[PDB]
């Protein structure tokens, strides 16, 4: 897992300053500003586990009575 390594490189760009027809600002500029935030819905629940049986009264410890008899 010994994973040492290093690199480096650089880009940049051409340079040219024209400065003949420059320095404008459209003064009657328009922008759209808000004061709002996003939303969501954390809809929560409860986990539920419920089942019924029917207890049946007596009708022998050994299934076959002849074996004991």
């Amino acid at each position: 897992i010994n994973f040492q390594d290093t690199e480096t490189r650089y880009g940049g760009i051409q340079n040219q300053v024209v400065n003949i027809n420059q320095y404008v600002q459209r003064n009657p500029n328009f922008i759209d500003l808000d004061n709002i935030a996003e939303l969501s819905e954390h809809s929560v629940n409860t986990e539920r586990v419920g089942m019924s049986h029917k207890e049946g009264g007596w009708p022998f410890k050994k299934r076959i009575e002849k074996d004991t008899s």
Partner: protein, 104 residues
């Protein structure tokens, strides 16, 4: 994978003041953005040079003939209810536990 964007909500709601309901919206935009910057530098556009230079021209010619007669102050404020912090309690209802025998 069809990427989901972390650091995002999943659905957007907002109140409609024409139809007095809400209405949620479960499609959320998922493009991470930080530092949008608005600019105001406008170079030989057709639409903006006219609309700026014309208004400055008309204002300055008008003043060359304060000029619009003096304005009038106004005031309006809305009704601001107060914020109170009140907290109440429910209680677990009580229960009884007896024991009885079976008679003859």
């Amino acid at each position: 994978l069809e990427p989901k964007n972390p650091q995002a909500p999943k659905n957007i709601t907002v109140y409609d003041y024409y139809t007095r309901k809400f209405k949620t919206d479960e499609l959320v935009d998922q493009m991470i953005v930080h530092f949008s910057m608005d600019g105001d530098y406008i170079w030989k556009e057709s639409n903006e040079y006219k609309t700026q230079e014309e208004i400055r021209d008309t204002k300055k010619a008008l003043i060359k003939e304060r000029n619009k007669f003096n304005y009038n102050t106004r005031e309006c404020q809305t009704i601001n209810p107060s914020i109170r912090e009140r907290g109440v309690s429910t209680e677990p209802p009580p229960s009884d536990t007896i024991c009885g025998n079976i008679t003859q």
